[PDB]
Symmetry: C2
Subunit: 48 residues, 2 copies
C-alpha cells in the first residue's frame, strides 16, 4: 500500500513440487574446513 | 606450585584406547526438539 491506495501483488500460493538443489558455499581462502564440515551439513539437512 | 615450592601431580600421558559413550542430554521439559535434533548430532559427531 502506498499513501492513497493499495496494490495487489501476490494472490496466495500452495506448492506442489520442491527442488532443494542448494549449493552450500564456494569459499576456500580461509582454512575453514572444521567449521565448514558441519555448516554445510546444516545447509543440507536441517535447512531442507 | 604453592608459595615456597612446587608439587608434581601429573607426569605426562599418551593414550592408547578411546571410548566415546557420551550421553547427549536428559532434558525433556522445554519443547526443544528442533534445536535438540542438531545439538545432539553435534554432541556425537563433531565432538568425537
Amino acid at each position: 500500500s502506498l499513501g492513497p491506495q493499495s496494490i495487489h501483488i501476490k494472490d496466495a500460493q500452495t506448492p506442489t513440487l520442491l527442488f532443494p538443489f542448494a549449493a552450500p558455499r564456494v569459499v576456500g581462502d580461509l582454512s575453514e574446513a572444521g567449521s565448514r564440515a558441519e555448516m554445510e551439513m546444516k545447509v543440507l539437512l536441517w535447512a531442507v
